[PDB]
Design a protein around this ligand. Structure first.
Ligand SMILES: [Ca+2]
Ligand SMILES: [Ca+2]
Ligand SMILES: [Ca+2]
Ligand SMILES: [Ca+2]
Lengths: 389, 389, 389, 389
């Protein structure tokens, strides 16, 4: 007995409890902490890990100068245990990557890193610490993936990739792998729809993803993947937009099928089905990546509901946030009969918003519980500028 | 076979042998050492760990500026092995917390961290590295806990919490948990009595705690918890006060039922029943947190005894001390038939007493043995001010 | 079940996927990273490790002054997991050595370090973390070895050593060991031929090595070792030279038996048999250790072929490279039926080519896959000079 | 199966091969390395560890100022794997101690640290990471022990302690322990003889120690302990003195029963019985702690032999040495049928000999092999003064 089932329903939860906080930038003032982005969480049967992209550079060093390309040859995926800062001396090497996803099937870690050139990039699949397969760019335009946990059901692991334009129609694929080896792929037909940077989780033996529309939608697309790779694709039905930037709530009319709101740009974000309701994350500000709030919509997975019945602030609107993503706790760690829904929020510090040569981020992680949880702000807390500035 | 019984009597001991000393502040002059408070010890079947609260900041860095609130959003519970300094690169993440307790039931670590807002704070229970339950503030006034080892008997783990005023009547609860899940709670009726920051241990299959009175008592309250959660509550009978600040010994009349001494303030401290005698810890000074001595009182658990029959100095009255707390060694590590009683002393350095921007502490840990042990001073030993000062 | 068989054929592969990159020098600007050379990779059943030679000195420290002899008494072999920087606090001690090889037989690591004086040096064999045997210099002229993975087949581990002149005829031996103990040696007769710094791998139950000629050959010698230690020895047949320095390709006529090209000097490098084809590594420049390319030659293992059918650039010719070496993934990690061929490239920074007091290197590791992989440059990326300069 | 037998003869060896070298001071110029003394080696069934005494202070920090007492309250015993520098972030806490011994019985580590006051000091026995027993000073004059590996035979572990004057008659005891608990002690009658800082090893099911005479002997005492604690005591028979300081070899007449040479002072050192021969370590200089040489004396364990038949220099007489001590490799690591004899040499840097505020040391470790090994110098190699100077 070794593979995780993950065929159970997602736990229905009234609130989200603080899991961990790494304080990485604050520690980085003096300690040896990588400059990072996308601090995503994923879990095995023994514990949860925080994954992150590095530039081979440390905070308070000249190499942190953020003029370096995002898609550089120095870009690597590394990991630490959840709540550990992304420090050099505890870190584990996962992949060469400027885009990533990772997940644990119950026996080993699977990690996928995209590197190489824009026009012909390479996704290298790792399983158990070594390359086992690859996917080459199929559309020759920045092959890329979730930047969050992929999802593993019964020994088969699932993720979503995109190749094509960052601001108009692109192409989308879902992938399936067992023990490091790709055993199926499907092209997701979604004309007029855009998909990036999906936040996925298991629920009831399917994969559900809530992704980012970077073309015209201030709502988030939703992708529901069956193990045979038939999928359903559309938009989160709810009548509140959860992308950033977005328009006022009052203005918004939702749509189960179309992007709405007619604005470009975006941020990675997430949501969890709760029967027919939905929990949705978003920044507080509609115009910038500041603040973090999670909102439950009555019937918001099946209807263009604006029925808000819960709201918990996790980062206040005076503080910088960023990407967020989803994962779940396995049953063997949680001890429950359902899959506990959890999320992470990245808190971006430095350039552009602040006068620094560098940019990094830290995180606050939260897990669904059966109780209301009070509002508070678990913000980054670093004091900028730093010495190297 | 996995759960620890801890149903055995506490070892009767004539003295306390040095276990470990981390030298954390001294190392922090150059190494990457968290700024800490409450360095409590707790043990599993494989070893003992030192837990501590951090601020996400390191010694000799600007983030150590101690103007930050105690109950900040950066506050986390972390741990290292006993005698390791609270350094970043060996540390293990336990909880987001500005108040904590932890203990090991024989299979996994249970850790409890309180964070969130004063008026509606959240205790998050961790078991095996993940959230499994919570307790929300029931009195909306700084929900808080032991800052020391909780106690585990036969797979059920016990701790004490307080919600209410820091200087007058507050409310007190005891909690019981199995595998991360709360299975019972009881309100402790104690009118006119105050309870904070309890130091508890197993003895004979009950939980005994020696807590801090921050209202009127220079004596320490005592709480004795049966596994069904019926409890006995009162004050340590002995005719010597062990709180700080306190009045002269000669002045003092003890009380098995009431606080005595009629002074406010306090410090976390401890004691161990020895049949009907008691070992009690206290600072040497009656007015400040300087020095550390442990005293055995003949019949001091059952009578208002002033019969002192042993005294061992562990920190001299020229050196700063602080909180102290209790724990026990499991039988599987100790190899004995009784539960060895052990304690830790925190040694506070920096503000208020010394001219620094920061405040941290280090520790000396001691374990009961069957021999008299000579007086000495295992003091912190750091040389202040530091560079950042 | 514990010993690795490694009796399987080498995987036939169309390309090489990025495995890892440590970014060691970049991190060394601020972190505590050894000054290194020869960052070779070798793997066990549980993972792959990067081995390296240190000088007991760190980057950005006065001890990194590179006036110290290469064959100094401070020289040690240490290791980290693949893709971890050669940092002090994750490193594992392997041997005292200014020349090395290491490999894992399926039960334990075998490590061999040469130290001591030029005229009578000592190779100390380590197995399972302790000395188990030695080989003393047999020719009293810088006893030395592969600086890469040795090769283990069925519990017996194989390596090649050289004792004698660095620029003319020297003497060569192959060694065989089980559980740390030498069980056979053979002198390799190779008059007029030179062998240094062999890069070997298992294939079909023999050991094949592609070594460096430092006397007259711009082609590489090839050594094929049977388990009874009979061997075949000659030169890589192919009509393209893969040493550096070398002459133009157009000029070159290959030879299965003789060194060709009539130039001295050299660099450690590698190649893999693919049935009758060969993959060969080389620097891009013919005159300096800049760039890295891998080329497949149709029939290049059996014929003086110039039939190039694949070429993948891994480091561009604007960036410094260095030594390269080979290893293979075990079947138990890879999950395949063949031995996946992998290599590493060292990227040298600092003196001579650059104005620094020091010299170190970092690495990019690559593994054979069943797909073409696009050209790119995974270069070191450090920004020199450093502070200590 | 868990306890080590260690009832086998000591391997007869013709030379000593380099095991490891930590380079600790050199790394300490930039890394976070404890200021140490007595870097002794001891081994379990899984590997060998280097133990060391720290002051809670790091190299290049103001706390390294060596005005601090040797017997301070900050003094702790810590350990790392053999060949790792004594760095903070890999170190393991063993005991509070300004004098120590440690050894592994096959199941757990036993560690013994002496701390507390000169006139009534406490040895705390640790087994499996916790206190299990103590020995209080019996003569009220600096209770102290080997500063090297103790010796474990069949689950019973043996060490030697001294209480009394450092320069004239003192009292000596041998101790026996199983699973952390003292099960026997014996007073060693040795009138006119002095014993300090014994270097012991198992051989043929007894414990043999070669100790330091700090009173009148430039020869070393020898102690042979049977498992029932009857002992034989005398001096190493050989006609060459191995203490430092000592008189010329030519002058010396050995003695199996008496100290000879009539000089005070001393240094910890070692020797190994080889049937009736002896290997003996000593500094090269007769007047200072410089150089290291090992010499085999024909019949030197049973006769006042001056028959020198082997000599291997390990540190040259231009370089600082210091204490040395003995240990053995277990059969389960070594794979042999005899106990391999190994030793360590400490290389002292800084005050007194050099102009520094601090004093620390590094080490070179060596293990017996069946071959002559060439002369060389594996010296410390640090470049003093350091910055803090
Ligand atoms: Ca959008
Ligand atoms: Ca009080
Ligand atoms: Ca050549
Ligand atoms: Ca002497």
């Amino acid at each position: 007995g070794t593979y995780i089932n993950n065929t159970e329903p997602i736990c229905d939860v009234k609130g989200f409890a603080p899991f961990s906080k790494d304080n990485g930038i604050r520690v980085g003032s003096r300690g040896h902490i990588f400059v990072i982005r996308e601090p995503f969480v994923s879990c095995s049967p023994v514990g949860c890990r925080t994954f992150f992209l590095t530039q081979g550079s440390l905070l308070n060093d000249k190499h942190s100068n953020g003029t370096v390309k995002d898609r550089s040859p120095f870009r690597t995926l590394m990991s630490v245990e959840v709540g550990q800062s992304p420090n050099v001396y505890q870190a584990r090497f996962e992949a060469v990557a400027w885009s990533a996803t990772a997940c644990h099937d119950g026996k080993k870690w699977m990690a996928i890193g995209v590197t190489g050139p824009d026009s012909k990039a390479v996704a290298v699949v790792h399983y158990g610490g070594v390359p086992t397969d690859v996917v080459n760019s199929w559309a020759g335009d920045i092959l890329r993936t979730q930047e969050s946990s992929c999802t593993c059901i019964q020994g088969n692991c699932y993720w979503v990739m995109t190749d094509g334009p960052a601001n108009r129609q692109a192409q989308y694929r879902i992938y399936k792998a067992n023990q490091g080896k790709i055993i199926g792929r499907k092209d997701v037909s979604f004309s007029g729809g855009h998909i990036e940077e999906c936040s996925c989780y298991p629920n009831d033996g399917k994969v559900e993803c809530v992704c980012r529309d970077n073309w015209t939608g201030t709502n988030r697309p939703v992708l529901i993947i069956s193990p045979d790779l038939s999928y359903r694709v559309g938009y989160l039905c709810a009548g509140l937009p959860s992308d950033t930037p977005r328009g006022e709530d009052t203005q918004f009319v939702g749509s189960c099928t179309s992007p709405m709101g007619n604005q470009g740009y975006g941020v990675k974000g997430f949501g969890f089905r709760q029967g027919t309701d939905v929990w949705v994350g978003r920044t507080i500000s509609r115009t910038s990546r500041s603040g973090f709030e999670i909102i439950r919509i009555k019937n918001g997975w099946t209807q263009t509901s604006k029925e808000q019945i819960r709201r918990q602030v996790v980062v206040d609107n005076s503080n910088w946030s960023g990407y967020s993503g989803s994962f779940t706790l396995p049953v063997e760690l949680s001890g429950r009969e359902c899959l506990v829904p959890c999320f992470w929020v990245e808190m971006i510090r430095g350039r552009p918003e602040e006068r620094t040569i560098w940019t990094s981020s830290s995180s606050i992680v939260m897990c669904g519980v059966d109780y209301e949880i009070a509002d508070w702000s678990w913000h980054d807390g670093a004091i900028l500028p730093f010495d190297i500035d």
